[PDB]
Amino acid sequence: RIAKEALTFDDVLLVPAHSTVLPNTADLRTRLTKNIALNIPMVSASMDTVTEARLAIALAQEGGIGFIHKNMSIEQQAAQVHQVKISGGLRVGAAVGAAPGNEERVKALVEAGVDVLLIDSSHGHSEGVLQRIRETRAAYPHLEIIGGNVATAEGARALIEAGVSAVKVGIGPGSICTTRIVTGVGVPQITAIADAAGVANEYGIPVIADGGIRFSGDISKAIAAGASCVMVGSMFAGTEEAPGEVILYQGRSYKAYRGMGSLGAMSLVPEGIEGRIAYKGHLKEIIHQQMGGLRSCMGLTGSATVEDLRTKAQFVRISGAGMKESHVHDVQITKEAPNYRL
Amino acid sequence: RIAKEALTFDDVLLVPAHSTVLPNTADLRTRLTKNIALNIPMVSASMDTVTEARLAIALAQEGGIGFIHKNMSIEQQAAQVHQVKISGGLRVGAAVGAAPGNEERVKALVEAGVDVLLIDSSHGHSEGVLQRIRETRAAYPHLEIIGGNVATAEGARALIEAGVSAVKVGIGPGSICTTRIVTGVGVPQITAIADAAGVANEYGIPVIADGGIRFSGDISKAIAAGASCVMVGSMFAGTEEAPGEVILYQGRSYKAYRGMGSLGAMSLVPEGIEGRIAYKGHLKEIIHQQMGGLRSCMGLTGSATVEDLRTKAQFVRISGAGMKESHVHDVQITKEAPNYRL
Amino acid sequence: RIAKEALTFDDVLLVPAHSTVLPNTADLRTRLTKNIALNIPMVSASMDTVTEARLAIALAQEGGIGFIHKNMSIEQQAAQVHQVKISGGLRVGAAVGAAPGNEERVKALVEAGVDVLLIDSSHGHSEGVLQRIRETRAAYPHLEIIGGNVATAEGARALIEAGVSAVKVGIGPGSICTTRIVTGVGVPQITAIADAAGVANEYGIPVIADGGIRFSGDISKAIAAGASCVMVGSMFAGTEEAPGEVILYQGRSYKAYRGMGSLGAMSLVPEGIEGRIAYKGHLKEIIHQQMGGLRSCMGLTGSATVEDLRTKAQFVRISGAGMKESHVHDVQITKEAPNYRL
Amino acid sequence: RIAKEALTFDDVLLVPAHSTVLPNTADLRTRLTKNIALNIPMVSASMDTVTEARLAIALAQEGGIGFIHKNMSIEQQAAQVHQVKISGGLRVGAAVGAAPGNEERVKALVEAGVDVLLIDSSHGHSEGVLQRIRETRAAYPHLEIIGGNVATAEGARALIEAGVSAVKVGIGPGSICTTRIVTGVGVPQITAIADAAGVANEYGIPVIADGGIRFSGDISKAIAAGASCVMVGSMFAGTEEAPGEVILYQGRSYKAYRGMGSLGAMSLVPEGIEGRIAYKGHLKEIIHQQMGGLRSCMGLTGSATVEDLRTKAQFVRISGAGMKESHVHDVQITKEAPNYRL
Ligand SMILES: NC(=O)c1ccc[n+]([C@@H]2O[C@H](COP(=O)([O-])OP(=O)([O-])OC[C@H]3O[C@@H](n4cnc5c(N)[nH+]cnc54)[C@H](O)[C@@H]3O)[C@@H](O)[C@H]2O)c1
Ligand SMILES: NC(=O)c1ccc[n+]([C@@H]2O[C@H](COP(=O)([O-])OP(=O)([O-])OC[C@H]3O[C@@H](n4cnc5c(N)[nH+]cnc54)[C@H](O)[C@@H]3O)[C@@H](O)[C@H]2O)c1
Ligand SMILES: NC(=O)c1ccc[n+]([C@@H]2O[C@H](COP(=O)([O-])OP(=O)([O-])OC[C@H]3O[C@@H](n4cnc5c(N)[nH+]cnc54)[C@H](O)[C@@H]3O)[C@@H](O)[C@H]2O)c1
Ligand SMILES: NC(=O)c1ccc[n+]([C@@H]2O[C@H](COP(=O)([O-])OP(=O)([O-])OC[C@H]3O[C@@H](n4cnc5c(N)[nH+]cnc54)[C@H](O)[C@@H]3O)[C@@H](O)[C@H]2O)c1
Ligand SMILES: O=c1[nH]cnc2c1ncn2[C@@H]1O[C@H](COP(=O)(O)O)[C@@H](O)[C@H]1O
Ligand SMILES: O=c1[nH]cnc2c1ncn2[C@@H]1O[C@H](COP(=O)(O)O)[C@@H](O)[C@H]1O
Ligand SMILES: O=c1[nH]cnc2c1ncn2[C@@H]1O[C@H](COP(=O)(O)O)[C@@H](O)[C@H]1O
Ligand SMILES: O=c1[nH]cnc2c1ncn2[C@@H]1O[C@H](COP(=O)(O)O)[C@@H](O)[C@H]1O
Ligand SMILES: [K+]
Ligand SMILES: [K+]
Ligand SMILES: [K+]
Ligand SMILES: [K+]
């Protein structure tokens, strides 16, 4: 009944190794799905405070892909997909529910030229969800389909066998998620990525690490645990291109950020809250900061490619003291850096 | 892929043992490099807010050695080395980059009478860095050369085999460093010292523990894990002899302290920040405090020599509760001590 | 020798009156000097953290004029003046000292086409300052000269009698100034304006209210008290156009802002300090907000032009309680406004 | 029986005037007594946390005089006076009680060459204090005697009529004093000075403003109100030269500072408390800063000598808002100044 210990980002560090890679020469290309490549390993969450066309365009220009959220009419969703397609033949994705009734939406989104369809659910291992993956595969046998979310070996296998092109991993880790507290269920994200990747590696199916990314080092750790890219919410929330107006509070600027299972979003119990995230300027500058840290990791681990980081890098386990030593400590900071701040 | 647990200072304590050593009779002499001795096991970081000639002189007078930083013209660097040499034939060191183009600088510093040359890099296990160690060895076969930084057995071996006279250990532990967060890579300092020393002990090569020293007890722990001395930044920052003017803020005095990979220092992503450190008066008084604690450790472990502490002392692992018991607890402090303060 | 009570902004409120004026039909034009008009009643402080050519340009574009600070070589200051002169036909000022030896600097600035010359001093009623004004007026009979700073009727009188085209008013009210505290000398800014203006109005010489403006209401009050326009430092510090780079601190953005009598700026005791001011975006937007508050004021007072506000608006004296009532009270602010911020 | 409003420092500001005076040409000389001059207008408080021989010497060197406290044996107090007398030809004072039985102590201090004798009491208008002054004047007709403390014209009158060479002014304004709170008695320090001075000026007897000085502006105001010099306790407490050792607390340095009517000092109810004051360095440097602010004041008021400031400078009454305007406001201080500190 007690399966083992499980670990997340702040429980591990990566081991530096012999390297003939310099940061500016590391190759950040990776896979999102079996047949869709990315130039960087970053995708945006399908959240109404994160991804509509405007953010999807910016992110695609930088080499990632956005997933257009489903809190809008079918017509609006397809129009937003279309807009991204007609902006330079940029790749775009779109989410739909794992609930019956959604066939219309999927059709309109496929007709609109969507590159990758995401069946996002909080329980990718629900039979219901698997069934809707199977029917979607049968109806669209050449559509790249992302399923999840799962946190286990068996959950990944069940998704792969139902027909998905990629497995999405994460139950409960999101900055705004309260699932693990509200229900008591979830698995710490590093362990969850590795167990899922362990299985998915065998079908050549990529794993997307969704949730709980805060610092650029978490991106390196997620990928080294077996993920081919990461999906991020709070890190992109607050950018100029994210949906929503700037709000001024106590001398600062913010945009609204909320879980997709929060009361305001759902519009009988919520598994997310609503909050505010600091305004951060252009997404592009954030991506440069985040990829800067990753490139640097790849230099420190002698990882030439994302694949090298994903399959050959080592970790050590650390304690609470190890983590405090890792952050800045014993000094009063007077000038933060754009990749390290309150 | 998951190598093991790793530990830093606040995860361990040293075991008291039978002793015929009194604090005031302990012998603090040690080695910096294979052929350079120190009277105490302390060296100063090659940082623009820590070591120029003025601090290098004071520290050499107390029995350590300063490493003159490289953020100044070649001419200024050599003049600062010279100044330390003409101040009583005191020992001095100097840092250079591990980047091509630096041959000039090395030459000028050797001509200026530098005792020990430091190739400081954030990734001592980069092929590039090893190559520049090899060329420096070939060009100057009798120059004591320190290389690093590394955090592993294999990293130490690679440095020793490339020609270094000492191995420097530390990736990410520095008070002002954010490498471990920004990249996700690093190893907790105690484990890093021991793995490096494990290998280096065999070539008779000393290990320098660079970073994350906060209290005098960390010096004892670093040495007991296998280091022959420690390199310290924040502990010496703020002294009268450290570079920079005093700044008054909210009733207190400070000097600027910043990482050498911070934006202000580098003048595309930073792996340090900028901060302020409390003014602490004369370096000499700080050294007396810090060596006072070490001497006392050597009495409590029955260590006659640094070598005895480095090779025969024992540790125990402790928890978070163990560490809280170790600090002052349950009492409102009204009079701090100079070796224990906010 | 305790003539009278004296008042500043938070001591008074303006009385709403019969009006046929609307915010948008208010006429904002006014005088900076005897022979220089402005489209809006605002000038920038001659501080090295406020006005260089770039902010001078933006402010001119909007209807104001900037004063190029003197903390720079004569040639640098000249190129700055010329740079604004050639940017779209724009007016510009520059500041010099009343220190003897300033004759060469004055020449360059004049030869660079400067529209107005500020002789700025903390003590305009100083005989030495008066002489440099006489000497300057004799040498350049057609040069608009601003003299100050004064805080009295008799000091106003002395400056005008020496030849100034405008009297600048303010001793120690500045956000960053400590003169009142360190010397015990000065006059609350509304009384100082009215006293100076009583006199200068006899000569048709305009008064410039310099320092202590924080809210748009302060611009209204300063003008209703007698000034023809206001000079501001902190209100424009932190704008993109101001000199200095952005500093990230505790999750917010700032630029440095310091007094010209602070230790940093001096390189006798300092009479200012150094600080940081929230980054505010483009000056344009600050000016729009500020002037919106002044137009609403004019609409509330039946003041059609600046001159009507300056000579016919009435005031009431309030207590600390009236002031508490004037701010927001008894409610937790959740969304602030671009003209009302922490 | 509610004669009048009464004021202290933060109630007033001094009026800038026509000036041919510069800070550096200001003449700081003044009188402590009828027949004792000083080069600067500052004396030290006769407190066991402020003045012993060491601070007396430093203060004399700089142009002031210290009053040796009486919390010590008669012989100890004598050796203290003699110690200052033999240190470079320096003036010195010593304090005694108005308690009967003080005749022997007075003798020793006189025989040790004390230049001035302070009979200090919290109630100079006490008949017992008046008698001890008469008795003392009768016994030592040539001895400069300082009498006080008083807070009125009539109390000033009584002391002079008993034979004092100087009237010391202050009931309860001291940083560490609680007399006003515990007894309900006293007078705001500017009104108290002016009232006392009105009278003493009729006799050419100087007034000493004792207590409540915090900023250099307060020294200006106290002198403009009538005093010929100021007496300070907290402003010199915490200097190296003051008695007591340095206390480290919460990362800063302090010395103890306590009222002479506090429980600690008494070994009837206490009328002071005990506290700590920031360590400030060498007295010399404090005095340089303080007097720099006074010279700047003199330059602002056209006051060439102390006597011009004391008899011709004008004041305005301000509100809490004027006072808020006089300090730094609306900006986060990042570098304070040695004359303007938290
Ligand atoms: N990753 C997470 O931990 C997490 C948790 C909760 C919500 N969310 C997000 O917020 C939104 C909320 O919708 P939702 O309920 O997660 O999915 P959903 O789209 O409302 O439901 C889809 C399917 O999930 C299945 N399911 C089975 N048990 C549960 C359960 N206990 N809780 C939730 N679903 C179950 C069921 O088959 C259902 O039809 C989604 O967009 C998610 O991205 C994420
Ligand atoms: N000890 C640490 O954890 C650490 C980390 C970062 C910076 N620093 C300090 O700050 C300064 C910054 O310069 P730097 O970049 O560390 O060294 P550097 O002197 O700029 O670079 C020297 C060499 O490091 C090699 N390198 C390979 N991968 C990386 C990587 N991912 N990041 C950095 N270097 C790599 C490469 O061969 C390069 O030419 C140095 O003075 C260091 O002392 C220390
Ligand atoms: N407006 C204020 O309240 C205020 C106060 C202090 C400084 N400042 C600013 O800070 C900068 C520093 O210059 P500064 O200190 O004004 O003077 P300054 O620019 O160094 O000197 C100007 C002249 O002021 C005359 N002066 C006579 N007495 C005094 C006195 N007590 N204090 C100052 N000047 C006197 C004297 O003739 C001198 O040559 C300037 O840019 C000022 O605008 C402003
Ligand atoms: N300046 C002040 O406001 C103040 C107030 C309290 C104490 N102190 C200081 O603290 C020390 C303690 O001495 P002390 O308490 O002033 O007096 P003390 O030195 O113990 O006695 C001096 C004399 O004051 C006379 N006196 C009459 N009524 C009172 C009264 N209500 N309170 C005090 N004295 C009275 C009485 O003649 C007595 O002998 C001295 O060094 C004082 O300078 C100063
Ligand atoms: O309401 C919610 N409940 C639980 N998980 C959510 C909710 N909304 C979004 N998520 C998940 O949280 C992720 C973003 O996490 P973040 O990057 O830490 O902010 C999304 O990609 C979703 O998988
Ligand atoms: O910018 C930086 N990034 C990472 N490490 C740094 C940087 N600057 C200095 N260091 C390291 O931090 C050490 C000092 O650490 P400290 O003694 O805890 O302050 C130095 O000796 C360097 O090895
Ligand atoms: O160091 C200083 N001391 C006193 N006044 C200053 C100093 N520096 C600038 N000032 C004045 O303060 C003004 C700006 O005040 P603010 O608009 O309240 O920030 C300037 O126009 C100057 O008159
Ligand atoms: O215990 C006390 N009660 C009342 N006044 C005191 C006491 N101790 C000292 N004083 C007075 O307070 C002065 C110092 O005030 P300060 O300069 O504001 O710290 C001394 O010169 C005494 O006049
Ligand atoms: K660190
Ligand atoms: K303990
Ligand atoms: K209100
Ligand atoms: K002020």
**Domain locations along chain C:** 1-342
* A65 CA from centroid of ligand 5 (Å): 17
Size of interface B-D (CB pairs under 8 A): 36
Q: What length does chain D have?
A: 342
Among B247, B252, B338, beta carbon nearest to D248: B338
State whether residue B198 sits within 8 Å of chain A by CB: no
Q: Are B276 and B264 in contact (CB under 8 A)?
A: no
User: Which bin fits C279, alpha (ψ -120 to 50), beta or left (φ > 0)?
Assistant: beta
D214 interaction partners in chain B (CB closer than 8 Å): none
> What is the experimental method?
X-ray
Q: ∠A126-A128-A132 over CA atoms, to 5°?
A: 120
Closest CA to A143 of A169, A167, A109: A109
Interstrand relation of A247-249 and A252-258 (parallel, antiparallel or unpaired): antiparallel
Closest C-alpha residue for ligand 1 atom 29: A123
Question: Cα–Cα distances in Å, from C133 out to A10, C160, D301?
Answer: 67, 10, 20
Which of D10, D193, D316 to mutate to probe the C interface, most C CBs <10 Å? D316
Burial of C74 by CB count in 10 Å (0-12 exposed, 13-18 middle, 19+ buried)?
middle
User: HEC states along chain A?
Assistant: CCCCCCCCHHHEEECCCCECCCHHHCECCEEEECCEEECCCEEECCCCCCCCHHHHHHHHHCCCEEEECCCCCHHHHHHHHHHHHCCCCCCCEEEECCCCCCHHHHHHHHHCCCCEEEECCCCCCCHHHHHHHHHHHHHCCCCEEEEEEECCHHHHHHHHHHCCCEEEECCCCCCCECHHHHCCCCCCHHHHHHHHHHHHHHHCCCEEEECCCCCHHHHHHHHHCCCCEEEECCCCCCCCCCCCCCEEECCEEEEEEECCCCHHHHCCCCCECEEEEECCCCHHHHHHHHHHHHHHHHHHCCCCEHHHHHHHCCEEEECHHHHHHHCCCCCEEEECECCECC
Q: Are B269 and B261 in contact (CB under 8 A)?
A: no
Q: ∠D331-D334-D335 over CA atoms, to 5°?
A: 120
Question: Cα–Cα distances in Å, from A42 out to A152, A168, A223, B88?
Answer: 22, 13, 11, 59
Q: Which residue type sits at B82?
A: H
Q: Are A69 and A37 in contact (CB under 8 A)?
A: no
For the CA of A297, the closest atom of ligand 2 is 31
Closest C-alpha residue for ligand 6 atom 21: B45
User: Which bin fits A95, alpha (ψ -120 to 50), beta or left (φ > 0)?
Assistant: beta
Q: List phi, psi (to 5°) of D195.
A: -65, -40
Cα–Cα distance between A149 and A129 in angstroms, integer? 10
Strand partners, C207: C167
Cα–Cα distance between C186 and C150 in angstroms, integer? 9
Contact check, Cβ <8 Å, D251/B338 = no
Distance of residue C214 Cα from the nearest chain D Cα, in angstroms: 8
Q: Are A229 and A309 in contact (CB under 8 A)?
A: no
B250 interaction partners in chain A (CB closer than 8 Å): none
Interstrand relation of B36-38 and B30-33 (parallel, antiparallel or unpaired): antiparallel
Which residue has tokens 């609204």? A256
Q: ∠B176-B178-B183 over CA atoms, to 5°?
A: 160
For residue C65, the SS3 value is: strand
Which of the listed CATH numbers 3.20.20.70, 2.60.40.1120, 1.10.3720.10, 2.40.70.10 matches domain D1-342? 3.20.20.70
Contact check, Cβ <8 Å, A13/B264 = no
Q: Are D337 and D287 in contact (CB under 8 A)?
A: no
- Ligand 1: list residues with CB < 6 Å: A 97-99, 120-123, 126, 128-129, 149, 170-172, 177, 179, 259-261, 271
Q: Is the CB of D149 under 6 A from ligand 4?
A: yes
Q: Which residues of B are catalytic?
A: 177
Cα–Cα distance between D25 and D298 in angstroms, integer? 9
For residue C120, the SS3 value is: strand
Contact check, Cβ <8 Å, D16/C268 = no
A249 interaction partners in chain C (CB closer than 8 Å): 333-336
Among C249, C251, C338, beta carbon nearest to A248: C338
Q: List phi, psi (to 5°) of C319.
A: -95, 175
Q: What length does chain C have?
A: 342
CA A279 to chain centroid: 20
Cα–Cα distance between C212 and C233 in angstroms, integer? 9
> DSSP code of C251?
T
Cα–Cα distance between C203 and C217 in angstroms, integer? 27
Distance of residue B239 Cα from the nearest chain A Cα, in angstroms: 14
Q: Which residue type sits at B282?
A: H
Cα–Cα distance between A302 and C105 in angstroms, integer? 59
Q: List phi, psi (to 5°) of A12.
A: -135, 155
Q: Are A316 and B188 in contact (CB under 8 A)?
A: yes
List the single residue in B with minimal CA-CA distance to A21.
B126
Interstrand relation of D247-249 and D12-14 (parallel, antiparallel or unpaired): unpaired
Cα–Cα distance between D99 and A324 in angstroms, integer? 62
Contact check, Cβ <8 Å, B125/A17 = yes
* Structure tokens belonging to residue C79: 């190129």
Among A248, A278, A335, beta carbon nearest to C336: A248
State whether residue D12 sits within 8 Å of chain C by CB: yes
Beta strand residue intervals within chain C, DSSP E:
2-5, 12-14, 30-33, 36-38, 42-44, 65-68, 93-96, 116-120, 144-150, 166-169, 207-210, 229-232, 247-249, 252-258, 274-278, 315-317
Q: Is A257 annotated as a binding residue?
A: yes
List the single residue in C with minimal CA-CA distance to A247.
C335
Among D248, D251, D335, beta carbon nearest to B248: D335
H or E element in which residue B306 lies: helix B306-312
* D263 CA from centroid of ligand 12 (Å): 39
Among A249, A251, A335, beta carbon nearest to C278: A251
Strand partners, D316: D13
Strand partners, A305: A27
Distance of residue A303 Cα from the nearest chain B Cα, in angstroms: 12
Cα–Cα distance between D11 and D226 in angstroms, integer? 16
Q: Is the CB of B211 under 6 A from ligand 6?
A: yes
H or E element in which residue B312 lies: helix B306-312
* Structure tokens belonging to residue A2: 């007690």
Q: Are B159 and B167 in contact (CB under 8 A)?
A: yes
Distance of residue D279 Cα from the nearest chain B Cα, in angstroms: 10
Q: Are A46 and A121 in contact (CB under 8 A)?
A: no
Cα–Cα distance between C133 and C137 in angstroms, integer? 6
Cα–Cα distance between B56 and A133 in angstroms, integer? 68
State whether residue B278 sits within 8 Å of chain D by CB: yes
Catalytic position from the list C106, C177, C197, C242: C177
DSSP D217-285: HHHHHHHHTT-SEEEESTTTTTBTTSSS--EEETTEEEEEEE-TTSHHHH----SB-EEEEE--B-HHH
Contact check, Cβ <8 Å, C11/D296 = no
State whether residue D300 sits within 8 Å of chain C by CB: yes
- Out of D122, D126, D127, D149, mutate this one to test ligand 4's pocket (max ligand atoms within 8 Å of CB): namely D122
CA B170 to chain centroid: 9
Cα–Cα distance between D40 and B119 in angstroms, integer? 58
Q: Please, which chains are in contact with D (at least 3 CB pairs closer than 8 A)?
A: B, C
Closest CA to D275 of D216, D234, D215: D234
* B172 CA from centroid of ligand 6 (Å): 7
D337 interaction partners in chain B (CB closer than 8 Å): 248
Cα–Cα distance between C297 and C339 in angstroms, integer? 14
Cα–Cα distance between D194 and D190 in angstroms, integer? 6
Closest CA to D73 of D109, D33, D124: D109
State whether residue B210 sits within 8 Å of chain A by CB: no
Cα–Cα distance between C306 and C207 in angstroms, integer? 13
Q: Which residues of A are catalytic?
A: 177
* C321 CA from centroid of ligand 11 (Å): 11
Closest CA to B100 of B127, B61, B79: B127
Beta strand residue intervals within C192-246, DSSP E:
207-210, 229-232
State whether residue A297 sits within 8 Å of chain B by CB: yes
